[PDB]
């Protein structure tokens, strides 16, 4: 039932996650965060209790209200400063097309909550949301804006693609290799995701507002709720957390922190840096000889998974620059220099082998990988 979302169990997770994310931020940076960029997304195969929205509500310092009998969400209640041991953190939410289509009530809940936090009379150090929404509203009014229009526009926190549009708009740009620098990925990401969503209403073209929100963002955040997939076998992560981080870099001149969080065990959320998650998945899966031996029993399909892993690794380097030289070296050695893996791929799926070689050559070309051997360049080019 979409009216019962976020569930109390998704709330408990969102709250613990938000606390752990703030803490990780303070450990990394030595100061309270004031502005995160979150992605809310979904698959038919996800847990359904409303984790993303719960985390966003927790960050801003709002709690859902449930009907005790029915367990439906009836509204929200602002957590007062008396009940906060840290400041409210501003949240800019990028929603996927799936998320936008599936969960209009969640979007409306968050939109109303964050605007209500932005209207509180609280000190800037407790409430950066209100300070931003008041200042932007005031700048718009002083330009001649109708105050009501100005309050509407200053308070937008939910951005997505227009109706009938899916993904972040980067896949073709990366696959055709028709991007010069990361600024071109940021431009496509803004064109694609520049629509503001508010409670009840349809999407509104508001690219300038998205840019202003992203200019403030200090960390990019995305959550994973199961271990049946990872960030190097699905397009859900590079295009949202990856594309959002490219865009913040393009607007500010500094790459923000990216936190790829593990909500697979709801009682024990684990916050990780994207570099940590990348390395966990290379060790655990991509370069894991148990994983390689297993896909070597699935023929054409297995070889395609190897190739896809390299595609995603490249996509993360393209958007974020957070893929270390060691990862590219590791997959080169595991997939190309290991003659048993190389020969498996050449026999069962030579196109997948050619795609892997071509991707590693582009990684060299872009400065994502400097091969430990000079002969690796020629081998890869001769192979592709």
TrEMBL record:
The organism's place on the tree of life at top rank: Bacteria
Protein name: Cobaltochelatase subunit CobN
Organism in which the protein naturally occurs: Brucella melitensis biotype 1 (strain ATCC 23456 / CCUG 17765 / NCTC 10094 / 16M)
């Amino acid at each position: 039932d979409s009216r019962a979302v976020p569930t109390p169990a998704a709330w408990e997770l969102g709250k613990k996650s938000a606390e752990l994310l703030i803490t990780r931020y303070t450990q990394d940076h030595g100061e309270w965060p004031t502005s995160f960029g979150l992605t809310a997304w979904g698959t038919s195969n996800m847990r359904t209790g409303g984790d993303d929205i719960a985390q966003a509500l927790a960050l801003i310092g709002v709690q859902p209200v449930w009907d005790m009998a029915s367990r439906r969400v009836t509204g929200y209640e602002i957590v007062p400063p008396a009940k906060l041991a840290r400041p409210r953190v501003d949240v800019t939410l990028r929603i996927s097309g799936f998320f936008r289509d599936a969960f209009p009530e969640q979007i409306a809940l968050f939109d109303k909550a964050v605007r209500a936090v932005g209207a509180l009379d609280e000190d800037v150090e407790d409430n950066p949301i209100a300070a931003r929404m008041k200042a932007e509203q005031a700048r718009l009014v002083a330009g001649g804006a109708d105050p009501q229009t100005a309050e509407r526009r200053a308070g937008y926190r939910v951005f997505g693609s227009k109706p009938g549009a899916y993904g972040a708009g980067l896949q073709a740009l990366i696959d055709e290799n028709g991007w010069a620098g990361r600024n071109d990925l940021a431009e496509a990401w803004l064109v694609w995701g520049g629509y503001a969503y508010g409670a009840g209403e349809e999407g509104q073209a508001e690219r300038g507002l998205l840019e202003e929100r992203l200019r403030s963002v200090q960390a990019v955040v995305q959550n994973q709720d199961n271990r049946e997939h990872d960030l190097l076998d699905s397009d859900d992560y590079y295009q949202f957390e990856g594309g959002m981080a490219a865009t913040v870099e393009s607007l500010t001149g500094a790459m923000p922190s990216v936190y790829h969080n593990d909500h697979s065990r709801p009682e024990k959320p684990v916050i990780r840096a994207l570099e940590e998650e990348l390395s966990r998945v290379v060790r655990g899966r991509a370069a894991n000889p148990k994983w390689i031996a297993g896909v070597m029993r699935h023929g054409y399909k297995g070889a395609a998974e190897i190739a896809a892993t390299v595609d995603y690794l490249f996509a993360f380097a393209a958007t974020t620059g957070k893929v270390g030289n060691h990862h590219f070296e590791a997959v080169y050695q595991a997939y190309i220099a290991d003659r048993a893996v190389h020969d498996f791929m050449a026999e069962k799926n030579p196109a997948a082998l050619a795609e892997t070689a071509a991707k590693l050559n582009e990684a060299i070309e872009r400065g994502f990988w400097t091969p430990r051997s000079n002969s690796a360049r020629f081998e890869l080019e001769n192979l592709s």
